[PDB]
Amino acid sequence: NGMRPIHPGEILREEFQKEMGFSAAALARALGVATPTVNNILRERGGVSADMALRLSICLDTTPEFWLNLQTAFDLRTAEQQHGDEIIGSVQRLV
Amino acid sequence: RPIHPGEILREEFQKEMGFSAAALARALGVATPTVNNILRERGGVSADMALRLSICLDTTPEFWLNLQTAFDLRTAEQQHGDEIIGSVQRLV
Amino acid sequence: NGMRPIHPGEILREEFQKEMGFSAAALARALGVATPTVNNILRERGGVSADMALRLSICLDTTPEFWLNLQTAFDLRTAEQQHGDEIIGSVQRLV
Amino acid sequence: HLKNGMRPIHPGEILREEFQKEMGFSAAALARALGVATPTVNNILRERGGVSADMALRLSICLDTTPEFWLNLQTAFDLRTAEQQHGDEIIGSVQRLVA
DNA sequence: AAATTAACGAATAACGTTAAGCATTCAGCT
DNA sequence: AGCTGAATGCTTAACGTTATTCGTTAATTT
């Protein structure tokens, strides 16, 4: 707690895309998917699919869990920041 | 080879500790059908649930989500995996 | 500058959905379109189509220009406030 | 408060007449005046294309008019365009709501 | 004797592919 | 000695179709 809710397209576009110049359209067919599908993640609108993470790992010689792990961590502190306070009151802890 | 959402719940928490989904429902602040859907194991794991789930079970929310994403991954691995390797061309 | 930009779905969900109770799914089939198409306007992601505005006028017994006029006014002070400063510098006035 | 509609008019029609041919020169100088490339511009005089929202802000500047001017006739175009075009299909498929 | 788990059904909101709309860089005129 | 109409790429819009989440009835289970 106390840091930003970082999205996947942030660790994509400003990390990989900047080191080697990637074009969303060319990247799409490189991934075997339609352009908007790709560009919707670059638009930070998300999200990363599980089949998506699997294909990404192929291109980038990483593990598919890599692209998925930071993705889920986003939502957590997205919703934690959005409605997170509200769920705590309704839920009562168990032994 | 994969691990399901409800397999690590029903076989760990629901059976070896407490009572059934009805009481668990209002304890999690959601309706009953939402809960047993995971016990019925056909999917339905919320991201929002994990935040709620960590609370009852004194665990981290990250715990329940880590196996969740790993689920989709391993299921689809044999499922769409063959199609994925061929269609996707490697990058530098 | 001088006012905040206002989206169509704002003058929709508030003035209309709240005054007479609307439901995005039912409004969808009432408008002859798929639900997300409708709810994407309520989500204020945008945006109002020209064929759409014509459809709305039928349901709401208003003119189609009503829904379109506020649409164009939005983009105007969206872009005016976003990149608008950059536009003024690059454009040179004519007689 | 009734349809259906009649003949539309595009922005590039209201461009070449009243603005482009009268008192003025064409797309080469006009491009650089608007900060955009030539093809973007003549596409409207040729009427193949739409009127941008970003352009309307730029046109108001050159022609000492409001940006709303150019955008108002733009939507009226699409509305009137689609009015006879998809109009038959739209009236039938859409059923009026409580009002 | 009596809740309750499993099943229908609608809501919204994802993801996705498809199709259209937009500004640079080579070719054909004026 | 030019500059407008084509041809191609990018992105972003709009849309439809297809999946996950709560009410409510029905069947179950001491």
Side-chain angles (χ1 to χ4, degrees), chain C residues 63-89:
Chain C
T63 54
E65 53 162 55
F66 281 166
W67 295 102
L68 261 180
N69 276 318
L70 46 92
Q71 171 44 39
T72 37
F74 165 77
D75 327 307
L76 214 80
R77 285 189 144 94
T78 291
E80 215 174 322
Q81 278 153 65
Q82 187 67 70
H83 33 259
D85 300 276
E86 306 192 355
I87 283 163
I88 310 155

Side-chain angles (χ1 to χ4, degrees), chain B residues 2 5-6 8-9 12 14-16 18 20-27 29-50 52-73 75-92:
Chain B
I8 204 79
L9 178 90
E12 191 79 21
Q14 176 63 259
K15 290 179 64 184
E16 286 187 30
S20 174
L24 180 49
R26 184 168 197 177
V30 78
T32 48
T34 296
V35 198
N36 63 339
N37 273 318
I38 301 312
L39 291 156
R40 183 56 182 171
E41 249 223 27
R42 294 184 266 199
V45 171
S46 312
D48 171 80
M49 183 84 80
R52 295 179 185 256
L53 246 261
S54 62
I55 298 167
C56 297
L57 285 89
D58 78 93
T59 189
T60 52
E62 295 132 304
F63 165 80
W64 297 104
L65 255 17
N66 274 318
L67 47 91
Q68 176 46 41
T69 38
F71 164 74
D72 326 306
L73 216 80
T75 56
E77 214 175 321
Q78 277 296 293
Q79 188 192 12
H80 298 272
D82 44 75
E83 176 256 285
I84 281 162
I85 307 156
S87 59
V88 170
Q89 278 311 314
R90 192 181 177 99
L91 272 69
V92 183

Side-chain angles (χ1 to χ4, degrees), chain D residues 26-28 42 46:
Chain D
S26 86
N42 63 340
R46 183 174 153 257

Side-chain angles (χ1 to χ4, degrees), chain A residues 34 36-37 46-47 49:
Chain A
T37 300
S49 313

Side-chain angles (χ1 to χ4, degrees), chain D residues 35-44 46-50 52-54:
Chain D
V36 79
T38 47
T40 298
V41 198
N42 63 340
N43 272 133
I44 303 312
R46 183 174 153 257
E47 284 193 26
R48 299 279 175 89
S52 313
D54 172 81

